[PDB]
RNA sequence: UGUACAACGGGGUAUUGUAAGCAGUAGAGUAGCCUUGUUGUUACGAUCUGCUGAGAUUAAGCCUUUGUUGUCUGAUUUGU
RNA sequence: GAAUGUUACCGCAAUAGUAAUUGAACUUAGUACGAGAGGAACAGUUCAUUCGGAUAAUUGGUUUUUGCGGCUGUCUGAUCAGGCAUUGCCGCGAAGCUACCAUCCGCUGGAUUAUGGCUGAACGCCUCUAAGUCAGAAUCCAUGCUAGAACGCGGUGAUUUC
RNA sequence: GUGAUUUCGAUUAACGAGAUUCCCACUGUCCCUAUCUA
RNA sequence: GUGAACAGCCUCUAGUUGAUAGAAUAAUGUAGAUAAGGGAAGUCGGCAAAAUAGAUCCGUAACUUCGGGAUAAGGAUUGGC
């Protein structure tokens, strides 16, 4: 059987990873960043409520 | 198999089995059918004229409520007297 | 998923819970817990075991036949999916369970009528039969 | 899953080690099936090979017909007393242990199977499915 | 016998297991935390409606064990810059937020009740008129640091734990330039970061924790209480604390939270955000656990498939629980003696 | 000197399987009485039934707490 | 575990160890190839074997929870409530422990070997080799994982009133 | 000197802390361990 | 008292409360137990454990020196009132 370190299956994994998997990763990270910005804005709005 | 090949190919294509559903409305084809609610199976309660049967049930319920289906002294002595007797009994048992 | 009911005590069986025994005549007994399963293996009678719904309904601790109780059965004829029908079912299930709770409380109260009378009779017998301890009670008070 | 099975087989709790006698659940004329080996059994030192529902074993006939005795033949396990977990969510078990005689290609030697057949065994062996009257 | 890579079998130096590798950074991406802190709060069971083409269980439902990790938002209280040297990474500067809660100030004491609680009182004097010293140190980090990590601490007072001392850790910031990382940290000083701004559902994460201790076992010696890093645990649900119906799915309409009847055993109820992770993770209930992002871009269809949960088991774990809610229990049993 | 801690108590959650006492016109029958029956009568009587999913236990490594009572301190050592 | 002012928190990483394995199934396909009989593989998917590290939601086992109930003999006048029978015996039994008897998880870059080459002399032909250079094995070194030098190192907090 | 007795050097019931091969039953001997008490 | 019983178990009269103590409860050891499915596959070797066990009724083979074998084997039953 092909090993975990098998070069052919490693090349196949690399070419697969370069595509749809990485696209999913990038979209996920963008959404996570957007909701992190939303979280910061929410806390800053609570601080603004305190000031007001 | 042509649609499968165009989309993903065999082993990665994910066919939507709700697309060939024959319903009164097409927008209902992509809907989640609930099955659990408070320890009951929804499919068990799923049947036509459920509204008519529930109307009959509520009518019988109103009749029972009208008839009074949902609702401290003894001979010789009053409420305080029976309370004193019960208090003495509890004291004796203790 | 399907919520089953225990063959022995009739308690609900949820996914993964309990154990199933398939007999050679190919009928499946689902047990909610090893207590019920072991009682079944010992061949005890649920209708005799007081903590089972079989015994309770047999002996009259609770109602076995009721208009609310007739609503739920295993449907062997499927119905076409209809969103309005599903929403009406979701409403009616809560309404029916509420009505069944009211009827269950009424049935229990009807079962337990007379308890106050028996308690008063026993208290009267005890107080009358013990006049000498009332003297000590009054000495304290 | 050896030769004749249909697709992949998941792990099921082992119930029948080598040297076990199970019932024979077909009308081939055998009364029991004595396990001498289990096909597709991974090797570990000082471990008895064992079989589960849906497995193919090699068995002799301890009790049955004189023609069917004396010969090692393939059999397929269709019932086990040992409880196993079904992936949809149930732990279940049968009353006894039972298997059916078969050829190397998985075809049933007999004509029908008596008693419930394990769903896993039926879905793995199409001939068992064809000859089953009760599937769980 | 045994895997020789897990030698020596000695006790972990700390109860909080160390993260020894963060994901490789990509500067073009936005600023994100690589890791999060939580407390292990028991396990339960779910029914998943599986969509996995090729499988014998495609379009069929399976029952899975899951772990629940109680994750109230972490508080950002500091930043540390690292410079690479011919001898490895070296920390050059630590900058702290102006105010720190008693929850984190307890971490700096062995005997809190007896102390004058002077910790960081002289540090707070740097935010006096211009913040010039704080700004100079942040400028130093921006100029020389090649790796920036943020100091965060857990809000252990939001948990059912008897411990009042918060756990403090470094979390690597990935994405953006060094100056953008430092700006993000400075903006988030004394602010909370929620678990859903770090992770999301269907994502594969890694669990780093110290395992269950077993004392002396028969060569003989210490068994358990080792640092372990388990990888590729799928997130089945990121729940919200302020959300009723935490345990309700689209298929199960019962309005109920994630907390089982009677509470988790040896751990209270879940009243915060939580992570439902498929399978088991190292550690036992109440242990502090570190959740890390995947080190590599996973090439599995398992990392891609969406999770559709049908039902979450909220029956009692304190016995052979049969009822999901107390209302269901009452509706089954009926009217008891003390109800009248 | 606190959304402090503890001991009790309260509520959940579980385990078992229906407590003690009393009552019955339920109980193989036997004896006693006599208003010789067509639910005549009395004593004993394994067991049965109702009060009664009752009663008991439930953290000791379960969860929770607008209650009650209390506690909040001794000793040693460490300096560029 | 003493000592490197004290004490506390967060880190670095020299060095040492190191782990994954094999089979099958779908599709490619009844295709390439073949008078026929027969009949592959790469890319894309899904499982299992052996081994390892965990874990206790569920199922199973276990009970001094002597938790609840039951039984024999004797003893406390009887009832109640209990004692003794070296865990008296029996049924169930939470919690804990635990099982291939249960569940989960176990990767990806450089440099190479054999070999196949490019340019190219030696040797006015030629030549994969001499200078140079491209690919390439489950190999090597890294990545990752475990420990962390108690005489390796860094950052940071607080540092005694008589 | 032989060692009951009978029958035809062989044979022999009853008995044995004597020796050997199997059978049923049984099982933690084992697959494969796990738990409880002192 | 139970019981066939000077057995074992509990009690009355009489006697004793002696054995270095305290705190913890990891592995291991010794003694005593339980266990899914399988059932000798373990081992030189069923070693050790398990299973059997009292009494009443029925029933009992080969062989035999006619005395035995024999509690052969194999079934049913056992409380309280
Ligand atoms: Zn039960």
mmCIF file of C-alpha atoms (C1' of nucleotides) and ligand atoms in Angstrom, chain C residues 6 8-11 32-37 39 49 51-52, chain E residues 322, chain F residues 16-17, chain G residues 92, ligand 1:
data_model
loop_
_atom_site.group_PDB
_atom_site.id
_atom_site.type_symbol
_atom_site.label_atom_id
_atom_site.label_comp_id
_atom_site.label_asym_id
_atom_site.label_seq_id
_atom_site.Cartn_x
_atom_site.Cartn_y
_atom_site.Cartn_z
ATOM 1 C CA UNK C 6 -40.421 0.090 26.464
ATOM 2 C CA UNK C 8 -41.837 -3.734 29.884
ATOM 3 C CA UNK C 9 -42.606 -0.408 31.588
ATOM 4 C CA UNK C 10 -43.697 1.716 28.557
ATOM 5 C CA UNK C 11 -41.196 4.503 29.305
ATOM 6 C CA UNK C 32 -35.459 1.442 27.898
ATOM 7 C CA UNK C 33 -33.015 0.150 30.509
ATOM 8 C CA UNK C 34 -31.269 -2.940 31.792
ATOM 9 C CA UNK C 35 -33.682 -3.057 34.739
ATOM 10 C CA UNK C 36 -36.592 -3.752 32.389
ATOM 11 C CA UNK C 37 -34.446 -6.033 30.226
ATOM 12 C CA UNK C 39 -36.881 -8.347 34.557
ATOM 13 C CA UNK C 49 -44.932 -4.951 38.845
ATOM 14 C CA UNK C 51 -43.989 0.604 38.883
ATOM 15 C CA UNK C 52 -45.021 -0.118 35.271
ATOM 16 C CA UNK E 322 -35.364 8.437 30.195
ATOM 17 C "C1'" U F 16 -35.402 0.869 44.672
ATOM 18 C "C1'" G F 17 -40.172 -0.782 44.374
ATOM 19 C "C1'" C G 92 -32.079 -4.532 41.184
HETATM 20 ZN ZN1 LIG J 1 -38.032 -0.780 34.519
#
